Copies of this chain bind each other. A is one copy, B any other.
Amino acid sequence: LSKIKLFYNTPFNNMQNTLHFNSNEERDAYFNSKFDVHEFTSTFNYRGVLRVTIDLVSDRSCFEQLMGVNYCQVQYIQSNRVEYLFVTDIQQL
């Protein structure tokens, strides 16, 4: 029920230093246009703090090693509301 971007090597990792845009969809315009190597689609639970499973079928030396990700966008559809989250840890399975 929701499409997800997974931003790489982001500056936003102090839970207290942020960036600020004159208006929402001007920041969605910002974020929706910078990526390095990954976006997908799934859905996820809630209660912070929460988890989202994800996978990588194309590998040779990847497996986990999506690595540098630390921030992500989610937009729920249909709802089309956007919400950003820090990714705190990537435990592998």
Counting CB contacts under 8 A, is A92 at the interface? yes
Cross-interface CB contact of A46 among B46, B60, B91, cutoff 8 Å: B91
Q: Given the complex, which residues of B lie within 8 Å of A81, measured CB to CB?
A: 61, 65
The oligomer's copy count stands at 5
State whether B78 touches A47 (Cβ < 8 A): no
State whether A60 touches B47 (Cβ < 8 A): no
Q: Given the complex, which residues of B lie within 8 Å of A46, measured CB to CB?
A: 91-92
When C-beta atoms are compared, the residue in chain B nearest to A67 turns out to be B81
When C-beta atoms are compared, the residue in chain B nearest to A1 turns out to be B63
Q: Given the complex, which residues of B lie within 8 Å of A60, measured CB to CB?
A: 78
Residues of A within 8 A of B (CB): 46-47, 60-61, 63, 65, 78-81, 91-92
